[PDB]
Design an enzyme around this catalytic site. Structure first.
Site, PDB file in Angstrom:
ATOM      1  N   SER A 174      -2.097  -6.230   1.015  1.00 30.95           N
ATOM      2  CA  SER A 174      -1.864  -4.910   1.607  1.00 30.95           C
ATOM      3  C   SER A 174      -2.371  -4.879   3.072  1.00 30.95           C
ATOM      4  CB  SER A 174      -2.494  -3.824   0.728  1.00 30.95           C
ATOM      5  OG  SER A 174      -1.872  -2.565   0.947  1.00 30.95           O
ATOM      6  N   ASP A 207       7.274  -1.346  -5.704  1.00 30.92           N
ATOM      7  CA  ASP A 207       5.963  -1.121  -5.091  1.00 30.92           C
ATOM      8  C   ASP A 207       5.981   0.264  -4.456  1.00 30.92           C
ATOM      9  OD1 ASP A 207       3.828  -0.958  -3.122  1.00 30.92           O
ATOM     10  OD2 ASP A 207       3.651  -3.137  -3.185  1.00 30.92           O
ATOM     11  N   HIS A 258       1.516  -2.305  -6.704  1.00 29.51           N
ATOM     12  CA  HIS A 258       0.986  -2.618  -5.383  1.00 29.51           C
ATOM     13  C   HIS A 258      -0.152  -3.640  -5.420  1.00 29.51           C
ATOM     14  CE1 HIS A 258       0.587  -1.936  -1.136  1.00 29.51           C
ATOM     15  NE2 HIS A 258      -0.706  -1.707  -1.265  1.00 29.51           N
TER      16      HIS A 258
HETATM   17  C1  LIG Z   1      -0.892   1.145   1.475  1.00 30.85           C
HETATM   18  C2  LIG Z   1      -0.783   2.384   0.646  1.00 30.85           C
HETATM   19  C3  LIG Z   1      -0.122   3.616   1.001  1.00 30.85           C
HETATM   20  C4  LIG Z   1       0.581   3.956   2.218  1.00 30.85           C
HETATM   21  C5  LIG Z   1       1.170   5.306   2.325  1.00 30.85           C
HETATM   22  O1  LIG Z   1       1.052   6.261   1.251  1.00 30.85           O
HETATM   23  C6  LIG Z   1       0.353   5.920   0.043  1.00 30.85           C
HETATM   24  C7  LIG Z   1      -0.246   4.543  -0.059  1.00 30.85           C
HETATM   25  O2  LIG Z   1      -0.988   3.995  -1.176  1.00 30.85           O
HETATM   26  C8  LIG Z   1      -1.318   2.610  -0.692  1.00 30.85           C
HETATM   27  O3  LIG Z   1      -1.953   1.819  -1.369  1.00 30.85           O
END
Ligand SMILES: Cc1c2ccocc-2oc1=O
Length: 266
Positions: free
Chosen positions: A93, A215, A244
């Site tokens: 991420s 994701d 994710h």
């Molecule tokens: C990277 C990331 C995000 C980016 C934008 O909105 C929710 C998210 O939840 C996450 O883990």
């Protein structure tokens, strides 16, 4: 040393062949199913991002971490302190972009970057799909500060995917709520409103771009965007997985893909 202690740095093994960085809301434990398959062939380095729940909130410098560059400086500092002259960097991420930024300043320190669930930009514009409209993000931030615990419990199943009762969901809910709520809000704002698109053509270290087909925060088109705009040699592999944090929640399908990209050059 204090930098290593502050980031809970763990070094497993010795030798030249050698680093794994985690995403928002988790910590180095996200790599628990990958590390066992690395330790026989590599010196493995794990660390936590400043602001993770396992770190001391007193060390969270809001100005330093107001840009992703602050985190890349931390990464370079760890590599310098450990006297690592070259590594394969695996970034989950936000850590994928942190590794990218670090490689702009010190490309000599990285032989390869393997990205898991990466995105250079989450906010949509008329010519770019990142997956979120600004108004979506505003409501998320509002939800966080109004009731952190409630937000965590509703967000963790969505971020992790799969069965809402799974061990992975429970574990991510825990590490998410382990963050101090003001730090969580600030980091969330910094990450979700970041824009790394413009520096992609300057990357020189080869990149392997991996993500789940489903994701919450990363539309598949983002992987193709990274592939098209990175200035380095790159390859994409979209995995038949949900979530994710797929290396934590779906290791049977995800770990073999990550290992291939670690072990095999383009
Ligand atoms: C990277 C990331 C995000 C980016 C934008 O909105 C929710 C998210 O939840 C996450 O883990």
């Amino acid at each position: 040393g204090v930098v290593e202690e502050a980031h809970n740095v763990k070094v497993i093994g010795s030798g030249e062949a050698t680093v794994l960085g985690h995403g928002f809301g988790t910590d180095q434990s996200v790599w628990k199913h990958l590390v066992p398959h690395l330790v026989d062939d590599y010196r493995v380095v794990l660390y936590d991002n400043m602001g993770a729940g396992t770190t001391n909130p007193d060390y969270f410098d809001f100005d330093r971490y107001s840009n992703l560059e602050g985190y890349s400086f931390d990464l370079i500092a760890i590599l310098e302190d450990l006297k690592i002259e070259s590594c394969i960097f695996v970034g989950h991420s936000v850590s994928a972009m942190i590794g990218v930024l670090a490689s702009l300043n010190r490309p000599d320190l990285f032989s390869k970057i393997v990205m898991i669930s990466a995105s250079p930009r989450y906010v949509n514009d008329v010519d770019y799909q990142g997956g979120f409209e600004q108004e979506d993000l505003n409501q998320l931030f509002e939800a966080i500060r109004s009731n952190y615990k409630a937000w965590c419990l509703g967000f963790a199943p969505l971020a992790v995917g799969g069965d809402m009762d799974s061990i992975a969901v429970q574990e991510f809910s825990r590490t998410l709520f382990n963050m101090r709520p003001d730090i969580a809000l600030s980091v969330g704002q910094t990450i979700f409103q970041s824009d790394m698109r413009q520096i992609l053509p300057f990357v020189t270290v080869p990149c392997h771009i991996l993500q789940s087909v489903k994701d919450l925060a990363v539309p598949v088109v983002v992987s193709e965007y990274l592939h098209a705009n990175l200035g380095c040699e790159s390859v994409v592999e979209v995995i038949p997985s949900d979530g994710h944090l797929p290396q934590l929640s779906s290791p049977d399908s995800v770990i073999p893909v990550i290992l291939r990209h670690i072990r095999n050059d383009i």
